[PDB]
């Protein structure tokens, strides 16, 4: 069924942003929440943060809390991070999922967890 | 809306996991329906908040779970310190407690 | 995070085998604590949320409890078919869902 | 925390009944106390409930004119008063203090009935 | 007192003044309010933040909203039959003027039409804040107490 397609991997340098896409594959985004998964290089796990493009404001990373700017916007079939001020801590795979709120009526065997494919950040 | 303590004589000896439905009547969600446990005559402790929730006095021993109308408080192995009298209680709809369901022995 | 571990993490035990496995985080989780299994060739289930009160579903065998820093999900009786690993997430009150290790409990 | 009632209470078939309960080592007023009928073997009876701040009251319809909930607010001791006692009526009671309708408002809230009286074993015995 | 000694709220950032004193200073009533909301709209139920529900429905003033204390009721007004219950207003008109009390839930302007302003017909300002324990917590049930 869905993919979820993501943008690619590439470092990205401190104080600069860290660009990712989360991109449509053929509809199925709508409710589907573009939250952000981060998942930390090999220490642990993590949760970018993700943009609420359902009808409302968006959640940020508990994790950084703050400068988490992230943006998605699933009209024009491309998720964001948009992590403003990075410095290194990334180093990671960041993954696009159907995270937890993000089901669709249909493709209910790919459950709330519609993943990604993942990006290589680091310095 | 009403509650039934089924097994009002459950004998099941110390040591071995038992079932002891209280039964409500309703879909209750259990943030009201409570359990409170009284000596064979004395007054009601605080049992089981959450009607299958342990909280401090209550020791591991002590088992239930149960939703909608067939709450089994499926306790696991005894003892006399389970052998009080407990009234699961409703929280919900004008509270109606429980009058039966004590374990027995021998 | 508190950025989950539980503490028992391989509890060994067939069936019955008066069980404790317990999510102990790194610190305390109040009411916030998932105790998960996972259903081999499927998705994960969710059995218990804040240190008890089960799921509709997954029957009362994986059983809930423990209030403190850590919250102890016993089986009270398994039977063959409840291999399943118990990791656990923890429903953090803003996302966070960090999962668990795998405490499975087995058959021979 | 004691909720000190009476005992073995010698009412009759056609008397009144005043209970005590001693509201114990609590502020009395910033609470109510509701009540449960520990019929033998009948679970516990839902009585009803005195508000400790201005006595507001829900009484049991079994009981309407019968159980009359009332409380020496000064020496803070509950009088639950039922008439209609008989043999067939001689059955106990307890005090709580009624969190689940928390007072002041005879409105629902958090908690159960809660710290519970001493225990008025009535006996009405013909 | 009796504040300070909650477990974790995930809001007590006191929406006024500091969040100590209150025990100290003797103000006349705090007025407490109490409603239910989920995420999304908790996100607006603070001094300025005017947002989806406090640009609908529950608005805050310049400051002094008491000591605002939110928390998510997962286990508390939702059911994974993903209740239904509570109904708030989204499309209520627009955004009420800070700190009313609005059991006024006058219904939404929603134009082609003239008789009733609703468009087609009913537009609710009675939003079952139909959520579910599977969303977030923009989406959790949340019990919300207000100062």
């Known amino acids: 069924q869905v993919q979820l397609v993501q943008s690619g991997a590439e470092v990205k340098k401190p104080g600069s942003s860290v660009k990712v896409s989360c991109k449509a594959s053929?509809?199925?985004?709508?409710?589907?929440?573009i939250s952000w998964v981060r998942q930390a290089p090999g220490q642990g796990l993590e949760w970018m943060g993700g943009?609420?493009?359902?009808?409302?404001?968006?959640i940020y990373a508990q994790a950084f809390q703050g400068r988490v700017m992230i943006s998605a916007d699933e009209s024009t079939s491309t998720a964001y991070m948009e992590l403003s001020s990075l410095r290194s801590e990334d180093t990671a795979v960041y993954f696009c999922?159907?995270?937890?709120?993000?089901?669709?009526?249909?493709?209910?065997?790919?459950?709330?967890?519609?993943w990604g494919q993942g990006t290589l950040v680091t310095v | 809306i009403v509650l039934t303590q089924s097994p009002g004589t459950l004998s099941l000896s110390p040591g071995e996991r038992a079932t002891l439905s209280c039964r409500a009547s309703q879909t209750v969600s259990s943030t009201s329906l409570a359990w409170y446990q009284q000596k064979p005559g004395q007054a009601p402790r605080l049992l089981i908040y959450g009607a299958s929730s342990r909280a401090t006095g209550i020791p591991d021993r002590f088992s239930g779970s149960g939703s909608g109308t067939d709450f089994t408080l499926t306790i696991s192995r005894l003892e006399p310190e389970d052998f009080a009298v407990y009234y699961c209680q409703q929280h919900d709809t004008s509270l109606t407690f429980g009058g039966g369901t004590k374990v027995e022995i021998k | 995070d508190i950025q989950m571990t539980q503490s028992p993490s391989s509890l060994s035990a067939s069936v019955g085998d008066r069980v404790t496995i317990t999510c102990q985080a790194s610190q305390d989780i109040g009411n916030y604590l998932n105790w998960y299994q996972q259903k081999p060739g499927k998705a994960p289930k969710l059995l218990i949320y804040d240190a008890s009160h089960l799921e509709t579903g997954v029957p009362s065998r994986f059983s809930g409890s423990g209030s403190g820093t850590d919250f102890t999900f016993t089986i009270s009786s398994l039977q063959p078919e409840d291999i399943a690993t118990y990791y656990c997430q923890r429903y953090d009150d803003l996302p966070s869902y960090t999962f668990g290790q795998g405490t499975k409990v087995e058959i021979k | 925390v004691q909720l000190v009632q009476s005992g073995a209470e010698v009412k009759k078939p056609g008397a009144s009944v005043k209970v005590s309960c001693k509201a114990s080592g609590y502020p009395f007023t910033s609470y109510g106390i509701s009540w449960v009928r520990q019929a033998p073997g009948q679970g516990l009876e839902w009585m009803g409930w005195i508000s400790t701040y201005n006595g507001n009251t829900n009484y049991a319809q079994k009981f309407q004119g019968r159980v009359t909930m009332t409380t020496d607010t000064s020496t803070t001791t509950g009088y639950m008063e039922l008439r209609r006692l008989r043999s067939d009526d001689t059955a106990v009671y307890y005090c709580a203090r009624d969190y689940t309708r928390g007072a002041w408002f005879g409105e629902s809230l958090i908690g159960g009935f809660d710290n519970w009286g001493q225990g008025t074993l009535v006996t009405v015995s013909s | 007192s009796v504040l300070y000694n909650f477990a974790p709220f995930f809001a007590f950032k006191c929406y006024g003044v500091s969040p100590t004193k209150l025990n100290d200073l003797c103000f006349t009533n705090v007025y407490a309010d109490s409603f239910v909301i989920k995420g999304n709209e908790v996100s607006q139920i603070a001094p300025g933040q005017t947002g989806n529900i406090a640009d609908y429905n529950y608005k805050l003033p310049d400051d002094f909203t008491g000591c605002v204390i939110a928390w998510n009721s997962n286990k508390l007004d939702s059911k994974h039959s993903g209740n239904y219950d509570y109904w708030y207003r989204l499309f209520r008109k627009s955004k009420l003027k800070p700190f009313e009390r609005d059991i006024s839930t006058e219904i939404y302007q929603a134009g082609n039409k003239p008789c009733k302003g609703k468009g087609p017909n009913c537009y609710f300002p009675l939003q079952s804040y139909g959520f579910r324990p599977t969303y977030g917590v923009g989406h959790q049930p949340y019990r919300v107490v207000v100062l």
């Open positions: 999922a159907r995270l937890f709120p993000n089901g669709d009526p249909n493709s209910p065997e790919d459950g709330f967890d519609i």
């Open positions: 053929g509809g199925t985004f709508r409710s589907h929440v």
């Open positions: 943009f609420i493009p359902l009808f409302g404001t968006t």
